[PDB]
């Protein structure tokens, strides 16, 4: 059936359309009917569910109770693409899917359709509870980092709740508990502000298996306080005190999972979802053409650039700067013009909105709608704003070139017949990439699967001392991947040494986790020897100390998992979004820098 949103309905549940079950569950129903004694014979049962009156709906409820169903969508790319839920019957023709899982499924609500399947037996039901229910797996068994992460209006609401603002009545009150709900709901106050000092208990995990209460009065805001009612003990207050954007919230469920485990985090998520929606809705967040603010400077920069390029083309009329070099030249002009118009609009939409306590300008971060939307991390990006307010920029000709005259218009002012017709080139060229990307992607995953399936994970330990030496990835333009991110999880081949001679921080082989990676982070160790698969721990299996973290649940991988296929779908799942082929990614000029002179960022 078609998917709609689930905006109550906790994570492990799933709105299943009333009419549609009653079919799926037929055999089950007839069983119950014959037990209660409402039908002596199969034809009787059959007839009453055909007539579908009365007792039958009552028994349907009794049938469905705790019986996990499983939903599946479309291209199934990774194993997350099918998950299992407790249904809740709902009159309707469509299936309600909780928001948080929309990530995994890669599903919006524009007319996507889900299949539903019914586990029978017992074994299957248990495999659905203890494997595919959406509350087992909150972490992506590729990168390891959480999925489930709140998106889109949840983000916008948390980000609105926690802000600072100048003035906004009831500022500098001192209150305790807070609870502070009192005061937002009652008026009395504005949650964006006041920079209210509130007293708070912490409950740190400082002591092993015990929560030590620490309380104090902190300077914070009302909506911070309000939001603190959700956070389940064991975490610091400092996690909720900040602008709290998208990133922030992934990190916050990450820390929660790591510190206090699965059970309180899967609830904690829910709660976050709810308070997000809530508040975001209260905020009244909207969008209006005045929300797109074109900087006054734009006209001037474009005129200056029209004059420069005029100078160079007149030089071409004089014979100088042949069109060969003049092309790259004019590209270098209009692109710098792009960057300057961009910088102007970004400077204008951030900051400003200057409120006044006695000094008339404290110069606060803007509360502009589109700005908040990009800033929150909810929708969109700076680049995407620049299309609405500053220049569109240089257009890519379908042959992989750049047109000399870029589009000077944002979408707030419209495009010209000519410029729109030019935009078209690249639009369609890019639509037609997603086709190709599906086919080639899938063929790739097909082959990867095919090769990798026999891998199993059989023996527990192997005992091989071979391994791979692990370092940072440093290159020009500092380092992209830090050595903790590479060496996390895994396991250690031979030992590690402190920067001092004959000093070991880890024995033998060890599982390396967030704590051990903090040990290695605080010391000067720039290389760590780590054993891994492909060093052929054991025979057929790839034993678990190679390998060594399952991702997903953060413990080490248990014996008997696949690994094969997980890898293949982990590799292959991405690449749906990829540059694909035939791009030079030049950006500036075809001619190389030609400077062999090195440079350093730091000392």
């Amino acid at each position: 059936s078609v998917i709609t949103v689930g905006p109550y309905l906790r994570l492990h549940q799933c709105g299943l359309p009333k009419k549609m079950a009653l079919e799926l569950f037929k055999p089950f129903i007839y069983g119950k009917l014959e037990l209660r004694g409402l039908a002596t014979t199969i034809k009787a049962a059959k007839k009453m569910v055909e007539r579908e009156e009365a007792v039958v709906w009552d028994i349907l409820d009794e049938v469905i109770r705790e019986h996990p169903v499983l939903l599946n969508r479309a291209p199934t790319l990774h194993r997350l693409g099918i998950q299992a839920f407790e249904p809740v019957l709902i009159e309707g023709k469509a299936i309600q899917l909780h928001p948080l899982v929309c990530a995994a499924y890669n599903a919006d609500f524009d007319g996507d359709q889900m299949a539903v399947h019914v586990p029978l037996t017992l074994e299957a039901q248990l495999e659905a509870r203890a494997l595919m229910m959406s509350t087992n797996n909150i972490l992506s068994p590729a990168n390891g980092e959480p999925i489930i992460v709140p998106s889109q209006d949840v983000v916008l609401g948390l980000y609105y709740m926690t802000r600072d603002c100048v003035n906004a009545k009831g500022e500098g009150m001192v209150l305790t508990g807070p609870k502070e709900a009192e005061r937002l709901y009652r008026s009395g106050l504005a949650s964006l502000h006041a920079r209210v000092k509130v007293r708070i208990t912490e409950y740190e995990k400082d002591a092993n298996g015990e929560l030590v209460a620490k309380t104090s009065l902190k300077d914070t805001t009302v909506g911070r306080a309000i939001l603190w009612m959700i956070v389940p003990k064991g975490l610091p207050y400092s996690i909720v005190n900040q602008a709290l954007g998208k990133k922030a919230i992934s990190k916050m469920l990450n820390t929660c999972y790591r510190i206090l485990g699965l059970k309180p985090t899967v609830i904690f998520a829910d709660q976050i979802m709810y308070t997000g929606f809530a508040y975001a809705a209260r905020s009244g967040a909207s969008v209006g053409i005045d929300d797109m603010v074109i900087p006054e400077k734009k006209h001037e920069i474009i005129s200056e650039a029209e004059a420069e390029v005029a100078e160079i083309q007149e030089q071409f009329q004089s014979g100088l700067v042949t069109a060969g070099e003049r092309y790259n030249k004019v590209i270098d002009i209009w692109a710098a013009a792009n960057d300057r118009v961009s910088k102007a609009m970004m400077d204008n939409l951030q900051t400003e909105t200057v409120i006044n306590r006695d000094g008339q300008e404290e110069k606060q971060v803007s509360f502009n709608s589109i700005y908040m939307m990009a800033d929150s991390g909810a929708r969109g990006s700076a680049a995407q704003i620049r299309q609405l307010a500053g220049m569109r920029g240089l257009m890519a000709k379908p042959d992989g070139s750049i047109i000399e005259t870029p589009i000077t218009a944002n979408f707030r002012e419209g495009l010209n017949v000519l410029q729109y017709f030019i935009s078209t080139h690249g639009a369609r060229k890019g639509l037609a990439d997603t086709a190709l990307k599906t086919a080639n992607s899938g063929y790739l995953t097909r082959r990867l699967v095919d090769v990798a399936q026999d891998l199993v994970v059989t023996e527990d330990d192997c005992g091989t001392h071979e391994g791979i030496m692990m370092t940072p990835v440093i290159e020009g333009g500092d380092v992209k991947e830090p050595l903790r991110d590479r060496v996390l999880g895994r396991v250690t081949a031979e030992d590690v040494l402190k920067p001092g001679t004959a000093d070991i921080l880890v024995p033998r082989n060890t599982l390396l986790h967030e704590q051990w990676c903090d040990l290695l982070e605080e010391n000067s160790v720039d290389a760590v020897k780590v054993r891994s698969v492909v060093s052929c721990d054991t025979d057929f299996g790839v034993c678990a100390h190679c390998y060594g973290r399952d991702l997903a649940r953060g413990h080490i991988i248990n014996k008997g998992e696949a690994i094969g296929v997980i890898a293949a779908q982990s590799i292959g799942e991405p690449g749906t979004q990829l540059t694909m082929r035939t791009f030079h990614i030049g950006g500036a000029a075809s001619r190389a820098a030609a400077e062999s002179s090195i440079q350093v960022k730091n000392k």
């Binding site: 082959r447 399936q453 026999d454 696949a562």
Partner: protein
């Protein structure tokens, strides 16, 4: 090099169903090779549990039947 490496799998049932079926079955028919059913695709196509996961338990139980006799 991963397609070469699929087609070269010991079990003639997988890799037959990957790519090239004529070729595969001719190498296998002339050679007289037995499948052993030891991977996941074979088990699927025959319809039995997979040596993995929940069924992994159950393929040890049966494997101990082969070693013990």
């Amino acid at each position: 090099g991963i397609t070469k490496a699929s087609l070269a799998t010991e079990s003639f049932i997988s890799a037959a169903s990957f790519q090239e079926t004529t070729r595969v079955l001719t190498e296998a028919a002339v050679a007289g090779k037995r499948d052993e059913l030891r991977g996941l695709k074979e088990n699927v196509i025959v319809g039995r549990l997979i040596p993995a996961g929940t069924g992994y338990a159950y393929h040890q139980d049966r494997m101990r039947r082969r070693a013990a006799g």
